[PDB]
Amino acid sequence: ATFEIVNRCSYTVWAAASKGDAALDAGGRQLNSGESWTINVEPGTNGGKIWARTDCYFDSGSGICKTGDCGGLLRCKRFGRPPTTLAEFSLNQYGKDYIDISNIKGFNVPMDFSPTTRGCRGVRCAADIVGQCPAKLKAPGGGCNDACTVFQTSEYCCTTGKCGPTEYSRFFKRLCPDAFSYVLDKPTTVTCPGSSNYRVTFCPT
């Protein structure tokens, strides 16, 4: 499957793509404002994620980013450090693809995640979550942390599977109704035809 990753932000981002235990495609790349990078993701990929990283410095491809850092690598093999707005997908799962956007690991960069082929709609979280972020969730390194990252409670992290919405999750949900705001949120997952192709756009508006 092809994913065109487009940076419409006025600032550079370092795109990242991983399934947690492996890179997808090259795993990461710099995208200056306006640049597009097309990756290939193997059919059947389960639990893949694409995200933006901000304020990165890389030497051999080793360095640091202020949001979304994946163990200091330009080419991510693992998931990124919160806060990270997440484009999430599992492909060719019993004949269908499943996509969503998640704020469960916080928000750093606004994003649209849409199919480029027929049969389903896209999802978007493009509100100014960083600007509106509650004081207690603001990440000093940049972005808006989720409450699990900040407070490490069973309720925010949904550790027992028993959790409800919270004042913090409701903030993310108010700003972005079409993204997951906590682990047990009512799903905003979109079912697409198996083997669809996609575009992830940072700063779509």
DSSP state of 70: -
- Alpha-carbon distance of 185 to 11, in angstroms, equals 31
The dihedral sign for the CA sequence 182, 109, 51, 120? positive
Label residue 75 exposed, middle or buried (CB < 10 Å: 0-12, 13-18, 19+): middle
The residues pairing with 5 across neighbouring beta strands, listed in sequence order, are 37, 200
DSSP state of 202: E
For residue 102, the surrounding DSSP H or E stretch is strand 96-102
Phi, psi at 157, each rounded to 5°: -85, -10
- Alpha-carbon distance of 48 to 18, in angstroms, equals 6
- Alpha-carbon distance of 203 to 7, in angstroms, equals 7
Task: Please tell me the number of Cα atoms within 13 Å of 109 on its side-chain side.
Answer: 31
Resolution in A: 1.2
- Alpha-carbon distance of 4 to 146, in angstroms, equals 27
DSSP state of 140: T
